[PDB]
Symmetry: C2
Subunit: 259 residues, 2 copies
């Protein structure tokens, strides 16, 4: 039998581990191991976002998950949306624990510009946020920009190809979050020796209404990847709209990083 | 077109509003209004269970939902498992807002024994807690007993007839909870003039492995209902294993209390 892999899955801002509830059993039925991280103030994490004042604090449960792996184990690290930023922060700390980073409908940062750069670029040309609620929270680290998605924005821009049940679930579970853009704009740039050394692929949905295909090509042109996979018909929440096709993409990646 | 109704849906201990993600759109597509309540320290509520020391505090979100209804509106109030206790507490406060109580695989308290009676009986009877973790927390008014479901327990006793994705989702979202047995033992008996005045029906799954079909009969024998509905092949989490059959039962209940 083909050697199986351990996938570590990292969710998007304002969501939680729960988003992987369709994908996780598909991977485990194929014989792979899956860890679905719950970031700080996400899902059922007990902290409010107001208590998590920096991106490193946000990302700590992922760093802990990697720190805790047995010696010499390497994972397939999948980051979704803002999850791309978290996996890049993880790869600058534990590069040798990661076989390949998988940027799934994700922010793909570089090692030349400040770590906020690709978010700043998107926020400039984002289109509408709809009924999304923006608020500020003042901290010792400076002012944190918070957001709470609105349900019309969710339906139109994130979940438009998802079953109604998944949209209802999402309504029931999403939380106020942050993209930590202030904090990312002050952080030291991601390193070529850490992050930049790790193998990376991109998986894009063809109907992502949040992270459009032109912006993705821009990111990749600033920071190349070894291969691009496309999921036809996926919305942004591709693990909910097209879990099987996502499985297929992940499987194809895993067959490339046998070794 | 026949008259539609507002269903207020109340989840079990250690879960949250999310359990209703399948049922809610089935009920709304038929023209009914649904409010899926999140109780305190449940789901994404921001409190820990330790902070909610009394069943009244636990149930506050449900009381608030009922208080906020316009004048003269009446709902079908569905309580699932522990949710039976919550809906009896609500019916003792706002009996006039409730067209009918639906006890869904639920604890069905009486107006004769102390409020904890049916919980205390199940706890004497039941020998399948498995890898459930039991613990205490001392409050200024007494010991509060807590529980955290174990995953094996969940699979065997609650989710055995659910899709594997539902079980994975539940692993991702269940929380430490409580049946408030000490607080319920100290509380005034449920009243005849409030709770006991409201119409009530029971909906039972035929394969409930935590609230056994014989114990349901014992409760109903102890405190009668207008009508009993049975969902064939449902496990305890029948809104996840048999959501269309549950929708059928609720649709039948709405037609008997039509107005
Ligand atoms: Cl995001
Ligand atoms: Cl319960």
């Amino acid at each position: 039998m083909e050697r199986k892999h351990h996938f570590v899955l990292v969710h998007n801002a304002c969501h939680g581990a729960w988003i992987w509830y369709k994908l996780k059993p598909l991977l485990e039925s194929a014989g792979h191991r899956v860890t679905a991280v719950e970031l700080a103030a996400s899902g059922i994490d007990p902290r409010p976002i107001q208590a998590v004042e920096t991106v490193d604090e946000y990302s700590k449960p992922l760093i802990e998950t990697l720190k805790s792996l047995p010696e010499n184990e390497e994972v397939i690290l999948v980051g979704f949306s803002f999850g791309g930023i978290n996996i890049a922060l993880a790869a600058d700390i534990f590069p040798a624990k990661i076989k390949v980073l998988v940027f799934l409908n994700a922010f793909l940062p570089d090692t030349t510009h400040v770590p906020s750069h690709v978010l700043d670029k998107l926020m400039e040309m984002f289109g509408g946020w709809g009924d999304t609620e923006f608020s500020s929270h003042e901290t010792r680290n400076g002012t944190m920009s918070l957001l709470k998605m609105g349900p019309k924005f969710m339906k139109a821009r994130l979940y438009q190809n998802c079953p109604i049940e998944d949209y209802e679930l999402a309504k029931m579970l999403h939380r106020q979050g942050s993209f930590f853009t202030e904090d990312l704009s002050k952080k030291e740039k991601f390193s070529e020796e850490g992050y930049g050394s790790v193998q990376r692929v991109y998986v894009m949905s063809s109907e992502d209404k949040i992270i459009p295909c032109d912006f993705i090509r821009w990111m990749i042109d600033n920071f190349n990847v070894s291969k691009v996979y496309e999921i036809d018909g996926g919305d942004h929440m591709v693990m909910l709209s097209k879990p099987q096709k996502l499985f297929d993409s992940l499987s194809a990646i895993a067959t490339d990083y046998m070794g």
